[PDB]
Design a binder for this molecule. Structure first.
Ligand SMILES: [Ca+2]
Length: 223
């Protein structure tokens, strides 16, 4: 996250770190046994890390659980990033408490102008690289579909939304992918793609979770 603030340890209890020997993407806990992330974050041998603040120090609230199965959306297109969503089932159920909790799925799609919270351990500079050890947060509004399409002509589908600031300076960045966009207590987006980070007229692009509720519930119910 560029231009954000330090969340504070365990203040975003549904935030997960996906680890394959190092942190590579964020995720969101949706129930005690399932995580939602970005399909572009798919790999085999994922370890889900819950209750993290500093990803380099065992502080005492972590739960490390291996994934038992991963399911990329049936229509994921890696060239266009359309349907950039995946489900990961944990080998065992996480223990839920104040610091490890699930985020609720939306019953309605959020509108342009709604303020949301975006979080992750990604790069913090738009120029060069500096990866934080502790969870970073950014409050950003959902942009109008019109704004979004004008920033990225021919690339936004109905399963994507833009969030951020057209003036630049504040955005998600590398390593934030798969992380949550929460608006009014519901998971509305997944950090998916962008052009650079925090550049003027190039806000981050997010997977629109409200379009996938049916797929998520059906999938959880049978696996
Ligand atoms: Ca830790």
């Amino acid at each position: 996250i560029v231009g954000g603030y330090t969340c504070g340890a365990n203040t975003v209890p549904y935030q997960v770190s996906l680890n394959s020997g190092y942190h590579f993407c964020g995720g969101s806990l949706i129930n005690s046994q399932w995580v939602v992330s970005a399909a572009h974050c798919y790999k085999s041998g994922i370890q889900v890390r819950l209750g993290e603040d500093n990803i380099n120090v065992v502080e005492g609230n972590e739960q490390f659980i291996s994934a038992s199965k991963s399911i990329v959306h049936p229509s994921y297109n890696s060239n266009t990033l359309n349907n950039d969503i995946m489900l990961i089932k944990l080998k065992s159920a996480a223990s839920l408490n104040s610091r490890v909790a699930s985020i609720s799925l939306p019953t309605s799609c959020a509108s342009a102008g709604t303020q949301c919270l975006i979080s992750g351990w990604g790069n913090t500079k738009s120029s060069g690289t500096s990866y934080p050890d502790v969870l970073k947060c950014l409050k950003a509004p959902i942009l109008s579909d019109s704004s979004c399409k004008s920033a990225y002509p021919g690339q936004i589908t109905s399963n994507m939304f833009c969030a951020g600031y057209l003036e630049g300076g504040k955005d998600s960045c590398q390593g934030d992918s798969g992380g949550p966009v929460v608006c009014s207590g519901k998971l509305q987006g997944i950090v998916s793609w962008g052009s650079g980070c925090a550049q003027k007229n190039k806000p981050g692009v997010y997977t629109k979770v409200c379009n996938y509720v049916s797929w998520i519930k059906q999938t959880i119910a049978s696996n």
